[PDB]
């Protein structure tokens, strides 16, 4: 019973960080060879586990979370971070136990003309709880009162990333997979 780790890093389509997707992986045998035989993971950080002694970990479930963010936003995929991505899109718990992988995907997620298909939530009332997910799209107003943009204190809460093939390394798109271990 082979684990679908390959498929997760494999996927042609990745979701926006506000609508990040999770794959439950259980009752299977794990093959982490994709992590080491593909030397492009610019980010490979682990917490409470060892990146290299990784299959000696007997899990009930692993959770794989996939999404896209720009490079300068990758640092917020870590426990105890703050910022718009970590507070309104994807929040790790303080005792997160697993690894975080990320790799530059400019050749497939950026274009010459601009790729505005990936969005993040930049406005919200509360901060997210760890592993919480908010896919609503109600116009944001400081007062909680229904409104309609453009208007008195009123904005749509999602904003587009603009991915161009030809910008600074920190503005290029990065695919992120978060591996969570039970």
């Amino acid at each position, epitope marked *: 019973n082979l684990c679908p780790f390959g498929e997760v890093f494999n996927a042609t389509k990745f979701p926006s960080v506000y609508a990040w997707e999770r794959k439950k992986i259980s009752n299977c045998v794990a093959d982490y060879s994709v*992590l*080491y035989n593909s*030397t492009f*993971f*610019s*980010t*490979f*950080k*682990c*917490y*409470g*586990v*060892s*990146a*290299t002694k990784l299959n000696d970990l007997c899990f009930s479930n692993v959770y794989a979370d996939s999404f896209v963010v720009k*490079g*300068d936003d*990758v*640092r917020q995929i*870590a*426990p*105890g*971070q*703050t*910022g718009v991505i970590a507070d309104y899109n994807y929040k790790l718990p*303080d*005792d*997160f*136990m697993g*690894c975080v992988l990320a790799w*530059n995907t400019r050749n497939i997620d950026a274009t010459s003309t601009g790729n505005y298909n990936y969005k993040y939530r930049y406005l919200r009332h509360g901060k997210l709880r760890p592993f919480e997910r908010d896919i609503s799209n109600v116009p944001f107003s400081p007062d909680g009162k229904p409104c309609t943009p453009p208007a008195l204190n009123c904005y749509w809460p999602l904003n587009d990333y603009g991915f161009y093939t030809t910008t600074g*390394i*920190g503005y290029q798109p990065y695919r992120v997979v978060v591996l969570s271990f039970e």
Partner: antibody
Amino acid sequence: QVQLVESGGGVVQPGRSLRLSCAASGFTFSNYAMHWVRQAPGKGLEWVAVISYDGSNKYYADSVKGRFTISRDNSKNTLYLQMNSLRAEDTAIYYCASGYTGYDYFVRGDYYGLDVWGQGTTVTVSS
Amino acid sequence: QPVLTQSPSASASLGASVKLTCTLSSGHSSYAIAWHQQQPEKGPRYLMKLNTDGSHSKGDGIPDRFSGSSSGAERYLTISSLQSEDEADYYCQTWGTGILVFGGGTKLTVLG
């Protein structure tokens, strides 16, 4: 908001012992790697030791191997540095530090991040 | 184990900019590094990790006047619109096998 506060520094005679401590608050201490770094008065920073999240892997700077011993009590969120057979060249400020545990393709194994620094504690070794 | 070569001192006038340089020994040409700042009378502070492809990961609270770039066996810390507080020792640091390596450091004096 994370904080690392060291204790146990002071004056001892060469050839004696001393246990430094490092109190960690504000993060899941038992999941991060932990360092010791020291600075001799007017010298640069010199890395001393690192210990992995579970205490099963320890590495030491050449100049302290055989004498120093790094350990941790995860139940108390505390990091330790046992110094033995102290020398006058062990006079320095000693900081602890924390980091993530990453995989490095150029080493083909673990590297230990150092991304949060402590405040320091001073150790003076003199006859 | 790798060795890091920083120039022992550098200076520029307040409001100017500098590019601190750290060079990896040839055998570890592609190793990633980190930058640390030590202001006078203070402990160190983590700036950013800097990869071989030019990509950086800043710590939280690090101003945008600090950027990292990368070339060959060299690593650069760049500080724009220099302020009085940026006068400090800047240590680049790298990893070996288990062990970590610092450089000598660079005292940056901002003539202000």
